[PDB]
Design a binder for this molecule. Structure first.
Ligand SMILES: C[C@@H](N1CN([C@H]2c3ccccc3CSc3ccccc32)n2ccc(=O)c(O)c2C1=O)C(F)(F)F
Ligand SMILES: [Mn+2]
Ligand SMILES: [Mn+2]
Length: 179
């Protein structure tokens, strides 16, 4: 039982922890062993939820946080209703306002590297990419950041607080040296 596991459980909302645990076990992975991956999945999950809470009431369908089958079910309904092409890879949200899927990224390296990595993987000129770093940078497809500055600033503040909280516990370096 690691210090990182206990930190995660006190740092993140219980529903977030439970969803992250479920995600990991869906692919056979142990949150008690892959503890940096645990923290990362919780973080990404919270970002996705804060992101969908930006903007107006019915704006985003949340794909992330569901099991594989239901996530693709929702993607299928979105495609077979809006006519948007079916992504090769599961995204994180759908924007009913802009009519595009969103892939959220949270990285401990420069937003540039990670954006290039995700863009080359999906390759769809369709799925919108939005990367946040733990240093407060962000990078988004076609310089279009979807949300208000205020809703994005909230996410960046939260990411930096997670980083400080890891640091005060001497877990940050292991977390960063694991991505
Ligand atoms: C399963 C879905 N994944 C994979 N993987 C994911 C995950 C989930 C469970 C077990 C292992 C891993 C790899 S590590 C990681 C780290 C942080 C956040 C999410 C995750 N992703 C990494 C970055 C993302 O932005 C993202 O959306 C995912 C994601 O959604 C998929 F798309 F493949 F179906
Ligand atoms: Mn995802
Ligand atoms: Mn993502």
């Amino acid at each position: 039982g690691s210090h990182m596991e206990d930190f995660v459980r006190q740092c993140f909302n219980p529903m977030i922890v439970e969803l992250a645990e479920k995600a990991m076990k869906e692919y056979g992975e142990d949150p008690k062993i892959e503890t940096n991956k645990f923290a990362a999945i919780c973080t990404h999950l919270e970002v996705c939820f804060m992101y969908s809470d930006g903007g107006s009431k019915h704006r985003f369908e949340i794909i992330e946080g569901r099991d594989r089958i239901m996530a693709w079910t929702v993607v299928n309904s979105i495609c077979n209703t809006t006519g948007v092409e079916k992504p090769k890879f599961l995204p994180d949200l759908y924007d009913y306002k802009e009519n595009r899927f969103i892939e959220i990224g949270v990285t401990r390296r420069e937003v540039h590297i990670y954006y290039l990595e995700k863009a080359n993987k999906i390759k769809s000129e369709k799925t919108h990419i939005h990367i946040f770093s733990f240093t407060g940078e962000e990078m988004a497809t076609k310089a279009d950041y979807t949300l208000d500055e205020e809703s994005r600033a909230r996410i960046k503040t939260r990411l930096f607080t997670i980083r400080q909280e890891m640091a005060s516990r001497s877990l940050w370096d292991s977390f960063r040296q694991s991505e």
